Amino acid sequence: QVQLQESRPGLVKPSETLSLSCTVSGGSMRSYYWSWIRQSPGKGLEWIGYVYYSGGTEYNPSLKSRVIISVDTSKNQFSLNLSSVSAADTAVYYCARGVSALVSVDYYYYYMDVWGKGTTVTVSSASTKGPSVFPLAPSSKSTSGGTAALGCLVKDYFPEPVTVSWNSGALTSGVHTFPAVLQSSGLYSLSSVVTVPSSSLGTQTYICNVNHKPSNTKVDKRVEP
């Protein structure tokens, strides 16, 4: 089944050009209208433009002067370049598959059925900074009736986002990853906590897997009592 994957998230400096790509897997690029859409709170969803398989493009009039979309069918990829960015361009950027549907000789419609996962783009003159990961050890004895809360503190990174998994994705029950706080330093910190049975502290190893794609850093932190 077709899957779309945006390029890595991170920051773009003010006045530089934002460059993104989308890789299409599981299917062909022929017949489709490969689209870019962005979202930020209060902004709702904004269509940026699309490129048809063979190279033709159509753009949002409010962005047409700053936007180029292109396609590389040889690599099953299409791309967006948005020039002269400012804070107004900070958003989650989505790639999506536009589908045309014929109704009659003089009418057809479209829809966007398959969407990418979104990539978080921050327009900022600050520097990218990888995180420092510290373990949040479970208390020596439970205070919750037989469960142990343990976690990882992901400290002092920039920009968003960070993702956290536990035991390489084998542990999902009882996992809560909290949205980041922005500190007065202008850097982010977040925490992920998992709640497990107290007895499993002797029989199971707990490892949080922290990914900070903007800094090309991953950290696997073992959390011991």
């Binding site: 969803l45 057809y108 829809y111 510290f134 909290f178 980041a180």
Partner: protein, 208 residues
């Protein structure tokens, strides 16, 4: 061209939520509807005014005529809370999105926050830093305030608290952090994170 939508729609569970999308002569343009939940990508729920992709429940129904298109959600449940965007895109018009209607379901039972408080790790202390971590989950009425104390005295300076964020279960989560020096941490007898929710307060304490 511009599409308009009401900012929000409130409905009690089991009842019918009606979301409208206004546009001049929208009835002769193909309307799609997209559902977006917090932190997730949009999902197509209706295309060509009334058609449902595979796996969308028949509770979601679409209509379009004149200057108003409508997304009807029958037998609403908590899982339907989301932002819903209408869209026109066909042979005669480039994609336009409506401004989005947030659907909130009434009568959800209030939930008191769970509070988990962690002291500075030994690793962080040996790096000459200290952070207290106060994690707040599963509260529903929607908002909290957080206060910190050192021993018994209020501590502000060093406190940063997140906005509430919708959880999977439509409840809310938040975090509060107290940054301090290792010397501040070891000089006091205890620190406390105090979370107030609807005039009632949960307080957790940690000691060095």
């Amino acid at each position: 061209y511009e599409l308009t939508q009401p900012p929000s729609v409130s409905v009690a569970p089991g009842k019918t939520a009606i979301i409208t999308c206004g546009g001049n002569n929208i009835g002769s343009k193909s309307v799609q509807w997209y559902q977006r939940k917090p932190g997730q990508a949009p999902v197509l729920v209706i295309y060509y005014n009334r058609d449902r992709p595979s796996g969308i429940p028949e509770r979601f129904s679409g209509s379009n005529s004149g200057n108003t298109a409508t997304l009807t959600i029958s037998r609403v449940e908590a899982g339907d809370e989301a932002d819903y965007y209408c869209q026109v895109w066909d042979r005669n018009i480039d994609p336009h999105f409506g401004t989005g209607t947030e659907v909130t379901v009434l009568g959800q039972p209030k939930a008191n926050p769970t509070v988990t408080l962690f002291p500075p790790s030994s690793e962080e202390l040996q790096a000459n830093k200290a952070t207290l971590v106060c994690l707040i989950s599963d509260f529903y009425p929607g908002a909290v305030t957080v206060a910190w104390k050192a021993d018994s005295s209020p501590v502000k300076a060093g406190v940063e608290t997140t906005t509430p964020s919708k959880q999977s279960n439509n409840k809310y989560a938040a975090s509060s952090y107290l940054s301090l020096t290792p010397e501040q941490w070891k000089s006091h007898r205890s620190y406390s994170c105090q979370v107030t929710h609807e005039g009632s307060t949960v307080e957790k304490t940690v000691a060095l």
